[PDB]
Amino acid sequence: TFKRRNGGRNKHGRGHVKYIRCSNCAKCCPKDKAIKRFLVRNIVEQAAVRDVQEACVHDGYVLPKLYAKVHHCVSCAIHAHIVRVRSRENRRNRE
Amino acid sequence: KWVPVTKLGRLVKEGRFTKMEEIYLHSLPVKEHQIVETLCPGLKDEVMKITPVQKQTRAGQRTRFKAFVVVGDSNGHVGLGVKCAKEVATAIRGAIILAKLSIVPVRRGYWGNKIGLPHTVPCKVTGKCGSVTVRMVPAPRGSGIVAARVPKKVLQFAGIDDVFTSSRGSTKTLGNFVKATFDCLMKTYGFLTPDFWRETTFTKAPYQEFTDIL
Amino acid sequence: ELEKLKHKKKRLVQSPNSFFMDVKCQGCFNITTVFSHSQTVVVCPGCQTVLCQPTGGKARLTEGCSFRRK
Amino acid sequence: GRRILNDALRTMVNAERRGKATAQLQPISGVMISFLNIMKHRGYIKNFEVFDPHRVGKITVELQGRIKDCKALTYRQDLRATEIEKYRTRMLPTRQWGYVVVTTPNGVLDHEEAIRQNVGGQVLGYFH
Amino acid sequence: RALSQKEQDIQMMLAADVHLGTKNCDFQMERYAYKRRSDGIYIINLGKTWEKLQLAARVIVAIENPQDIIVQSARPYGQRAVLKFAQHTGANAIAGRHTPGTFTNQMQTSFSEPRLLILTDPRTDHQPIKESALGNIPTIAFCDTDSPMRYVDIGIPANNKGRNSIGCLYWLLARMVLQMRGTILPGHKWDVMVDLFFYRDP
Amino acid sequence: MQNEVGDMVDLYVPRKCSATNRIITAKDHASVQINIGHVDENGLYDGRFTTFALSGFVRAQGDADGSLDRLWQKRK
Amino acid sequence: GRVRTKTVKKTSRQVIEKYYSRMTLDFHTNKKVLEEVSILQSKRLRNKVAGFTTHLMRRIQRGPVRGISLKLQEEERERRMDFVPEKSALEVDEIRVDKETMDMLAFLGMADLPGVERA
RNA sequence: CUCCGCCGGCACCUUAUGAGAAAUCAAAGUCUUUGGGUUCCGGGGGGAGUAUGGUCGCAAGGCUGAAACUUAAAGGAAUUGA
Ligand SMILES: [Mg+2]
Ligand SMILES: [Mg+2]
Ligand SMILES: [Mg+2]
Ligand SMILES: [Mg+2]
Ligand SMILES: [Zn+2]
């Protein structure tokens, strides 16, 4: 039995893909297999943004934003619910 | 009594058919089994195997019996029925119903010399169902049916007289084995023979010929 | 008819996509024959200006070089 | 590599089985057209073009759907006119129809022709 | 001079915007689409559309009893087209949802053995397609430039997703079948006007 | 077909697809038989129709429509 | 925990099919309507179905409703079904299309048409 | 950069009319209607890539590689249940 068409990693036309480190357990998994999300979070959540616009010394100042491209392995992604086990049929779609 | 629900059943009830040649020639879906008794009178049915299949549930494992019946008159009509049911007898009945629904036409041929009625299959035919494949090869007059007990019991209904049988795959699984035999028969009218070469003059379908009674 | 978009060697009777073109410049009112896919710079014998630049496909003409297929 | 008279027949089987009206053949041969002459003589394909402009060649046959299977026996056999009799049973569907085409010193010809002219040769292929 | 039935009918289809297919095409019916506009949607030879319309009309008329013909439209843009088509041609329209098993389950309440099956869309009405493939049921389907036209015997190349086109095309079939059967005697006059087939939404 | 006596032994010489010439077997429930009427003059119909038959193969490909078309352009 | 079962809802729709002008909004009036127009075996089921039919009233009386079919509403929906404009609203006297839609007609030989114009 | 077409790539999406034990595959199709050419390679599970012999390597090891005996199943795919 073969669980997936591409094996869980998108590797065609290559022989080796440079590995990376999980952001949680530091496991070495290939860059084309790691669950890679580009999280862009506020510095503070919206219940503490009025309170910082009431403290910025210069008016018209916009809050910076944290841009960071976190990597996870499959183990940590499943465990932290980044991704979930989907049915045999729903498994295939990429949307 | 009957009160047929398919208009084929209606026409058969008023008896404006005589033999299943027209229904076969027009490839119509036969949906009421009580057409075929009135259209094929000399019909004989035998069950061969009752193999019990078992689904397993929380409480235990629940058994059903499925029946493999062959029906057919010894003149080129043979039909296979498979039916799974709780009880042996009702499995037999449902199988015989589906089998008399699955009557199909088997064409015969001569080995080399066209004297007497046709006895052997027209040519080499192959039928496959799952893993088992069966071949019938034409045989000269008076060589019998060389085949296993199952396809020989199919062919003795099909009316074939002489034939050479070569089989592949797991012939022990009687379901696939008899279904491959039947698939190898019901495709003997699938062979573009030179004898068919003359282009066909069409015939009105039963619906448009017996329209006014609909 | 699609037999012109269809590949060079997949047509019914395979035929070239190229042609010989007579190029005539602005500075030297004579005619010189050049090939569609020139592969080599060619210069007018008198005026010595370039007629074409080799390219992966058809050669590139210089400004004011009128050419007739032939 | 190419070992045509298979590249032609397998194209013809594929075209027929898909129901295409005409099939074209990229290389040709005197042997190829002599095979198609056997088919057309025995009434299995209708007439056809032989595009011979300048090269190996090209052909276009029109299929009438009357053919059912046609093959080449590359690994071209030796074949006596005493022992075709167990090739006809070994390959052809029955003893009434189907033809085995064997090349013989009298050119390409089918096995029934080989019975009457009593000349054997090498199997080019068959069709039925 | 005068006009031909060609003239009037092609004008009617230009008006009801039938010639405009969509962005895509299927190799099966690319033979009807003629050229692309640079915006990207295809357009259909309405002459070839009307040729197929005559084909379908002859097939309809060759039916002895029109009570054995079923026409379907699952798009709500076509129910008012199909019932008006049905009451005129004597056919039997099944508008709305198609209950699966209509053509096979013999002791179903909604059973029938139609001589012929007309569909506004093979794509949406693909269920009747599949049952027709099991019931020996010839089919005339209204194929757009996106129509996956498996199991279709006669396919009219036409837009079938518009407020006007579905109403127009069934009105063409209505008039043509009625001319064929002669209920409207020779003469382009017919006492039914097209905007009736357009669906009247609340 | 023909017995050597001349008697005819085989039953329902089956109809053949008009577009691909493979024969419709007795259980190709994906096979259809179109009737196309003929129109003559005032009235524009009588019970004179041409008949076509198509196997499951041709329909399943989808190219059944092209077959009906290209066989309807035959004249008489 | 008060959802009505099929023995309730089927009966409510079926009785509201047949008896519309003869039953009204008021719960108790519908009770006594149902007494003479149906035979049941429990006063609580009687109350149950009457109380479902009463808001079936309160929904029908303001807007349309699913399958349940009544002549006094289907006939009017047919009367507003079958109307047409005084003349066909789509007019052929002016048709505005582009070059390829004209190529249609030109390939069909029809370079000249009534009412076809260049955009 | 937009559009259309050719080749040659890496792939992907839909469908059997095909194939398959199926999973699945547009190439694992054109296979009992069996034959384009060619190399390597398997013959139930163990014992075992083990012993012995050879050979290469500094060594680890690599390549080549059995038998005795034992066993009625081992195994693949999919179904239901737990
Ligand atoms: Mg590469
Ligand atoms: Mg690697
Ligand atoms: Mg072993
Ligand atoms: Mg397993
Ligand atoms: Zn991790």
- Label each residue of A27-73 as H, E or C: CEEECCCCEEEEEEEECCCHHHCHHHHCCCCCCCCCCCEEEEEEEEC
b/e A43-69 (16+ beta carbons within 10 angstroms → b): eeeeeeeeeeeeeeeeeeeeeeeeeee
Strands (E), G59-108: 95-97
Pairing of strands B61-73, B44-56: antiparallel
What residues contact residue E147 under an 8 Å CB cut-off, 6+ apart? E26, E29, E121, E122, E123, E141, E155
Distances (CA, A) of D118 to D31, D34, D81: 21, 19, 6
- Taking the C-alpha atoms of residue A75 and residue A24, their distance in angstroms, rounded to an integer, is 10
CB C17 within 8 A of CB C3: no
- What phi, psi does B166 have (nearest 5°)? -125, 125
What residues contact residue D30 under an 8 Å CB cut-off, 6+ apart? none
**Residue B31: which of B15, B51, B7 has the closest Cα?**
B7
The position carrying tokens 């996509």 is C17
The pocket of ion ligand 1, defined by CB under 5 A, consists of A 13
Task: Tell me whether residues F27 and B199 touch, CB distance under 8 A.
Answer: no
- Taking the C-alpha atoms of residue C11 and residue A66, their distance in angstroms, rounded to an integer, is 59
Closest nucleotide (CA of C6 to C1')? Answer: H6
CA of A1 to the centre of ligand 4 (A): 8
- CA–C1' span, E133 to H19, in Å? 23
C-alpha atoms less than 13 angstroms from C-alpha of F76 in its C-beta half-sphere = 10
- What phi, psi does C49 have (nearest 5°)? -75, 155
What residues contact residue B18 under an 8 Å CB cut-off, 6+ apart? B39
What residues contact residue B21 under an 8 Å CB cut-off, 6+ apart? B105, F11, F12
**Residue D114: which of D91, D67, D82 has the closest Cα?**
D82
CA of B131 to the centre of ligand 4 (A): 18
- What letter would DSSP give residue A89? T
DSSP-based three-state secondary structure for D25: strand
CB B104 within 8 A of CB B93: no
CB B108 within 8 A of CB B160: yes
**Residue E144: which of E128, E127, E162 has the closest Cα?**
E162
CB B81 within 8 A of CB B99: yes
- Taking the C-alpha atoms of residue E151 and residue E157, their distance in angstroms, rounded to an integer, is 15
G21, G27, G33, G35: CA torsion to nearest 10: 160
- What phi, psi does E47 have (nearest 5°)? -60, -45
Residue type, C65: C
What residues contact residue B140 under an 8 Å CB cut-off, 6+ apart? B111, B112, B120, B162
Token pair of E19 as six digits: 């010639």
Host H or E run for residue F33: strand F32-38
Cβ count within 10 A of residue B147:
22
- In chain D, positions 64-93 with C-beta closer than 7 Å to nucleic chain H are 68-69, 71-75, 90-91, 93
- What letter would DSSP give residue C2? G
User: Considering CB atoms only, which of B29, B32, B212 is closest to E135?
Assistant: B29
Q: Burial level of G1, CB count in 10 A (0-12/13-18/19+)?
A: exposed
CA of A22 to the centre of ligand 1 (A): 29
b/e D66-97 (16+ beta carbons within 10 angstroms → b): bbbbbbbbeeeeebebeebeebbeebbbbbbb
The position carrying tokens 């449902």 is B94
**Residue E10: which of G84, G102, F68 has the closest Cα?**
G102
- Taking the C-alpha atoms of residue A41 and residue A65, their distance in angstroms, rounded to an integer, is 6
- Taking the C-alpha atoms of residue F29 and residue B28, their distance in angstroms, rounded to an integer, is 7
- In chain B, positions 114-133 with C-beta closer than 7 Å to nucleic chain H are 124-126, 128, 130-131, 133
Residue type, C19: F
- Taking the C-alpha atoms of residue G8 and residue G24, their distance in angstroms, rounded to an integer, is 18
Q: Give the chain E residue whose CA is nearest to the CA of G117.
A: E14
CB B8 within 8 A of CB B2: no
Contact, D13 CB vs strand H, < 7 Å: yes
Whether the CA torsion B96, B97, B98, B101 is positive or negative: it is positive
- Taking the C-alpha atoms of residue D117 and residue D84, their distance in angstroms, rounded to an integer, is 13
Pairing of strands B44-56, B103-105: unpaired
Contact, B62 CB vs strand H, < 7 Å: no
- Residue ranges of the annotated binding site of A for Zn(2+) are 22, 25, 73, 76
**Residue B73: which of B175, B5, B159 has the closest Cα?**
B159
- Taking the C-alpha atoms of residue D71 and residue A23, their distance in angstroms, rounded to an integer, is 62
- Taking the C-alpha atoms of residue C55 and residue C57, their distance in angstroms, rounded to an integer, is 5
Strands (E), chain E: 33-36, 42-44, 69-73, 92-95, 116-119, 139-143, 154-157
Q: Burial level of E141, CB count in 10 A (0-12/13-18/19+)?
A: buried
Task: Tell me whether residues F10 and B187 touch, CB distance under 8 A.
Answer: no
Token pair of C59 as six digits: 């050669």
**Residue E112: which of E55, E178, E73, E65 has the closest Cα?**
E65
DSSP-based three-state secondary structure for D95: coil
- Taking the C-alpha atoms of residue C51 and residue C59, their distance in angstroms, rounded to an integer, is 9
b/e G64-77 (16+ beta carbons within 10 angstroms → b): eeeeeeeeeeeeee
- Taking the C-alpha atoms of residue D14 and residue D11, their distance in angstroms, rounded to an integer, is 5
Task: Name every chain E residue with its beta carbon within 8 A of the beta carbon of F72.
Answer: 55
Contact, F8 CB vs strand H, < 7 Å: no
Token pair of C7 as six digits: 């590949």
Residue type, D126: Y
Task: Name every chain C residue with its beta carbon within 8 A of the beta carbon of D53.
Answer: 13
User: Considering CB atoms only, which of B29, B113, B190 is closest to F25?
Assistant: B190
**Residue B167: which of B210, B199, B110, B128 has the closest Cα?**
B128
Distances (CA, A) of F33 to E185, E191, F54: 30, 34, 7
Distance from CA of B49 to the nearest CA of F (A): 26
- What phi, psi does E103 have (nearest 5°)? -110, -10
Provide long-range contacts, Cβ within 8 A and 24+ apart, for G88-93. Answer: G88/E193, G88/E194, G88/E195, G89/E195, G90/E15, G90/E16, G90/E164, G90/E194, G90/E195, G91/E15, G92/E11, G92/E12, G92/E14, G92/E15
Give the sheet arrangement for strand D107-110, strand by strand.
D70-72, D122-127, D99-104, D107-110
User: Considering CB atoms only, which of D66, D95, D96 is closest to B197?
Assistant: D66
Distance from CA of D41 to the nearest CA of C (A): 27
- Taking the C-alpha atoms of residue F13 and residue C3, their distance in angstroms, rounded to an integer, is 44
**B positions 52-81 inside 8 Å of E (CB):** none
CB D93 within 8 A of CB B123: yes
| DSSP secondary structure of A7-31 | TTS---S-S---EEE-TTT--EEET
Task: Name every chain F residue with its beta carbon within 8 A of the beta carbon of D18.
Answer: 61
End-to-end CA distance of chain F: 31
What residues contact residue D38 under an 8 Å CB cut-off, 6+ apart? D99, D101, D108, D109, D110
Distance from CA of D95 to the nearest CA of C (A): 41
CB B188 within 8 A of CB F25: no
Chain H bases having any atom below 7 Å from a protein CB: 3-7, 10-14, 16-17, 19-25, 29-37, 76-82
- What letter would DSSP give residue C43? B
Q: Give the chain B residue whose CA is nearest to the CA of D66.
A: B192
Contact, D6 CB vs strand H, < 7 Å: yes
Whether the CA torsion A47, A52, A53, A55 is positive or negative: it is positive
Task: Tell me whether residues B191 and D68 touch, CB distance under 8 A.
Answer: yes
Q: Give the chain C residue whose CA is nearest to the CA of D50.
A: C12
- Taking the C-alpha atoms of residue E104 and residue E113, their distance in angstroms, rounded to an integer, is 9
Task: Name every chain E residue with its beta carbon within 8 A of the beta carbon of G76.
Answer: none
Task: Tell me whether residues F65 and E29 touch, CB distance under 8 A.
Answer: yes
**Residue G20: which of G51, G60, G48 has the closest Cα?**
G60
**E positions 49-78 inside 8 Å of F (CB):** 52, 55, 58-59, 61-63
CA of A15 to the centre of ligand 5 (A): 24
Experimental method: cryo-EM
Q: What is the 3-state secondary structure (H, E, C) of chain B?
A: CCCCCCHHHHHHHHCCCCCCHHHHHCCCCCCCCHHHHHHCCCCEEEEEEEEEEEEECCCCEEEEEEEEEEEEECCCEEEEEEEEECCHHHHHHHHHHHHHHCEEECCCECCCCCCCCCCECCCCEEEEECCEEEEEEECCCCCCEECCHHHHHHHHHHCCCEEEEEEECCCCCHHHHHHHHHHHHCCHHHCCCHHHCCCCCCCCCHHHHCCCCC
Cβ count within 10 A of residue G54:
19
CB D28 within 8 A of CB D57: yes
- CA–C1' span, F30 to H28, in Å? 29
C-alpha atoms less than 13 angstroms from C-alpha of B107 in its C-beta half-sphere = 27
Q: Does chain A reach chain F with at least 3 CB pairs under 8 Å?
A: no
What residues contact residue D80 under an 8 Å CB cut-off, 6+ apart? D120
Whether the CB of F61 is below 8 Å from some CB of chain B: the reply is no
Cβ count within 10 A of residue A4:
9
Give the number of the ligand closest to the Cα of residue A35.
Answer: 5
Task: Name every chain F residue with its beta carbon within 8 A of the beta carbon of E134.
Answer: 29-30
Q: Does chain A reach chain E with at least 3 CB pairs under 8 Å?
A: no
Q: Burial level of D47, CB count in 10 A (0-12/13-18/19+)?
A: exposed
Q: Mutating which of D16, D68, D95 best tests the B interface, going by the most B Cβ atoms within 10 A?
A: D95
Across the strands, what pairs with C66? C24
Contact, C60 CB vs strand H, < 7 Å: no
Q: Burial level of E126, CB count in 10 A (0-12/13-18/19+)?
A: middle
Distances (CA, A) of E81 to C5, E89, E167: 43, 12, 5
Token pair of E168 as six digits: 């127009």
- Taking the C-alpha atoms of residue D127 and residue B177, their distance in angstroms, rounded to an integer, is 30
Token pair of B163 as six digits: 């034939």
CB A43 within 8 A of CB A63: yes
Give the number of the ligand closest to the Cα of residue A1.
Answer: 4
What residues contact residue B183 under an 8 Å CB cut-off, 6+ apart? B127, B128, B129
Distances (CA, A) of G33 to A27, E160, G11: 76, 50, 14
What residues contact residue A77 under an 8 Å CB cut-off, 6+ apart? A35, A83
Whether the CA torsion B12, B14, B16, B19 is positive or negative: it is positive
